[PDB]
From a paper:
Rab11 family-interacting protein 2 (FIP2) is a 512-residue effector that contains a Rab-binding domain (RBD) at its C-terminus. The effector FIP2 contains an N-terminal C2 domain that binds to phospholipids (residues 15–102; Lindsay & McCaffrey, 2004), a myosin Vb-binding domain and a C-terminal RBD that binds to Rab11. The N-terminus of this modular effector family is variable and consists of domains that include EF-hands, ERM domains, C2 domains and myosin V-binding domains. These effectors regulate membrane trafficking following their recruitment to subcellular compartments by Rab11, Rab14 and Rab25 GTPases. The crystal structures of Rab11–FIP2, Rab11–FIP3 and Rab25–FIP2 complexes revealed that the RBD is a parallel α-helical coiled coil.
Here, the crystal structure of an uncomplexed form of FIP2 was determined at 2.3 Å resolution by the ab initio phasing method in ARCIMBOLDO. In contrast to previous crystal structures of complexes, the structure of isolated FIP2 reveals the formation of antiparallel α-helical dimers that are stabilized by polar interactions. Although the segment 439–512 was subjected to crystallization, a minimum of the first seven residues and the last 15 residues are dis­ordered. The polypeptides are of varying lengths depending on the extent of disorder at the N/C-termini. The structure reveals antiparallel α-helices that associate through polar interactions. These include a remarkable stack of arginine residues within a four-helix bundle in the crystal lattice. The distances between the Cζ atoms in the stacked guanidino side chains are 3.5–3.8 Å. Aspartate residues form salt bridges with these arginines and presumably contribute to orienting the guanidino groups (not shown). Since crystal formation required the presence of a small amount of Co2+, data were also collected at the Co2+ absorption edge. Also, FIP2 spontaneously forms dimers in solution at physiological pH. It is probable that parallel dimers dissociate to form the crystals observed here at pH 4.8. Therefore, the physiological relevance of the structure of uncomplexed FIP2 observed under these conditions is unknown.
Author numbering: 445 to 497
Write the structure that this text describes.
Amino acid sequence: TAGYRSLTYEEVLQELVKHKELLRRKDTHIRELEDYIDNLLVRVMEETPSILR
């Protein structure tokens, strides 16, 4: 009864937290790729004397 309610509560909490953590990991991965592209743009800056003359 009280136990059924507590299991229900914990189950909703667990499911929401599961999906939040999935999204958090995806967010981390996208930020990593954005940083990689930013670094390539910095490299292109550094390499501009070779690309343009």
